[PDB]
């Protein structure tokens, strides 16, 4: 842990970016696989921060690890591999908390490994595991976005003013595919500090030819009156109908409801978790607190904030939105309500 945490957020880990976990490790990593080591280093340094990008990188690293995995004698691999992959996941979590996508993916991989019988050969098992990972990715990530792109194309109209927030690999694709089909609309990109990841969507839209706008989230109440729809992306859909997404989503949906604007949500079926949550206090993630430091004017005001023992710096990442503010959810199965997540989980 680094720095002093908040009283209400003292049950969560607060790591740092400068403090690397590879200091107390061998350059040729013995206990940990080099692939997983570099993956955790990238996660800690922020090289891979996308919800789906993180899962894809994790699965590719796991494929690489399996490619060079030798089953010892005196034991089967169907269990040795599961027992060996656990410390890797623990190290990855120590580097950066895992996401719901990564959790579901490792669960599916463990289930598939357990489904392998000792009756089969090692090479056949490894090849089947690799092919299974490949086709699972292609289905739940690649093919799971083409159906959502043609389902949301119906709800997009000419002259619409769609409002997006943050960065999402699915929202940008939906908009870029709807623009090329014949729709002529304009997008409003909302961003928040300190990540400022909305600029990614802004650039991806400008390069596509869609008229786009950019403004910070505090001014969301000023532009919403002219907004017709609010298309948002999330990281996970809880079993209680709620939605887990970036911290600046719940208040955005609240202001949209206050302005009488229909809110939408687009998520893949593989992000349908089984747990539940009521607020952003029981399970969240506190990133490095020094990200709030900003060069405003002539000097920084939080340059030595740790000298003040009473001052705390909260850097929440995720948040939980109630089902009372979500109208429609878009998936590969079709348009379903916000209170139908358990039905899809069935």
């Amino acid at each position: 842990d680094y720095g002093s945490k908040v009283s209400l957020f003292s049950h969560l880990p607060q790591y740092s970016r400068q403090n690397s976990l590879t200091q107390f490790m061998s350059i040729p990593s013995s206990v940990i696989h080099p692939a997983m080591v570099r993956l955790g280093l990238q996660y800690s340094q922020g090289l891979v921060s996308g919800s789906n990008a993180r899962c894809i990188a994790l699965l590719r690293a796991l494929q690489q690890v399996i490619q060079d995995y030798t089953t010892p004698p005196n034991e089967e691999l169907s269990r040795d591999l599961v027992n060996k992959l656990k410390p890797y996941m623990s190290f990855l979590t120590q580097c950066r908390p895992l996401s719901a996508s990564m959790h579901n993916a490792i669960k599916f991989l463990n289930k598939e490994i357990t489904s392998v019988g000792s009756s089969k050969r090692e090479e056949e098992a490894k090849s089947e595991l690799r092919a299974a990972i490949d086709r699972y990715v292609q289905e739940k990530i690649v093919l799971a976005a083409q159906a959502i792109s043609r389902f949301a194309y119906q709800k997009i109209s000419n002259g619409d003013v769609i409002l997006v927030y943050g960065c999402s690999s699915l929202v940008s694709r939906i908009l870029q595919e709807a623009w090329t089909e014949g729709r002529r609309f304009r997008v409003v990109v909302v961003d928040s500090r300190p990540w400022l990841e909305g600029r990614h969507t802004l650039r991806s839209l400008v390069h596509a030819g869609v008229p786009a706008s950019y403004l910070l989230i505090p001014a969301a109440s000023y532009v919403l009156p002219e907004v017709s729809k609010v298309l948002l992306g999330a990281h996970a859909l809880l079993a209680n109908g709620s939605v887990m997404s970036r911290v600046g989503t719940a208040q955005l949906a609240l202001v949209a409801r206050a302005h009488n604007v229909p809110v939408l949500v687009c998520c893949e079926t593989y992000k349908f978790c089984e747990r539940v949550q009521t607020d952003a206090f029981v399970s969240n993630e506190l990133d490095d607190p020094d990200d709030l430091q900003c060069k405003r004017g002539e000097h920084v005001a939080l340059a030595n904030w740790q000298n003040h023992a009473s001052l705390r710096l909260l850097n929440l990442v995720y948040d939980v939105t109630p089902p009372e503010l979500v109208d429609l959810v878009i998936t590969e199965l079709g348009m379903i309500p916000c209170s139908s997540v358990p039905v899809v989980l069935r």
Binding site: H11, G241, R275, V276, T278, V282, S283, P323, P342
Partner: protein, 318 residues
Amino acid sequence: GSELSERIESFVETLKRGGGPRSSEEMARETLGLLRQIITDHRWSNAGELMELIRREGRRMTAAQPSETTVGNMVRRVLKIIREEYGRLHGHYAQLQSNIIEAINELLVELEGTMENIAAQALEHIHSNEVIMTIGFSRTVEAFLKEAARKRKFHVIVAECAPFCQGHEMAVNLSKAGIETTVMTDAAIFAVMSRVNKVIIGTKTILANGALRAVTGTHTLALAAKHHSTPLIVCAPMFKLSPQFPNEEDSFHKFVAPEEVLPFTEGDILEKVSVHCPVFDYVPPELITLFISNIGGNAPSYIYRLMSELYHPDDHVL
């Protein structure tokens, strides 16, 4: 089996007179054991005779006390078990008894395990320096609270019930564990329901539409929560879940002697004044936030599926 009839009559009398065991878990276990005994010591050839006999016995037990929504659930569960077994064996009239007994035992052991299954989910919803309040006295909520008090720290507030002040025992039990609990009356709920961050309560029965028939006083708590936008959680096992709706039902509440509300030593005014003492009340589903069950949390909008899974639609009327 005259001894079986004697046991049945004793159970019906103790249920209609002053109720069976004090806790709901023991009530459900005793009902399931009585049903198993009935299934064992009785003669029948086809499953129809057995199922109609069980239907009649459950109807009698429910007429003995309609407000005890714990025995009808067990009767419907046994009926569904019998129907599933008959459909599996026919989809049979010589070995259907032993397998029913095995299924009933499997149900019994999980009935007992429900307490731990519920208490294990305490750290998922409780965080540090939280302010939670409760009303009444429930073993499930007591365990849910005292199971997370070892690693987590929070403040508890217990509101007593006016007719039967049962929250005092819960407050004492929680103070014995060092949770920093506070005791108050049921008339100061809204007054203190502004610094509260969450609410956890226990119920007596879960209706089909996701509604709760809990002790009198929880409807006002739910209304105040919805007014202040505070998540209200209900911890109740699956055997407290009945396939009946709020309306379409008479004798919903239980009315006891007015002695608890207005004592007999008042005077002559007792001839004019009309006193009523309701034990339970109705809470609509719109004021509920989450349902902590043995299979994890669930929103009030996903109760119909659990109903269709547990009970049979034709066994709702019983």
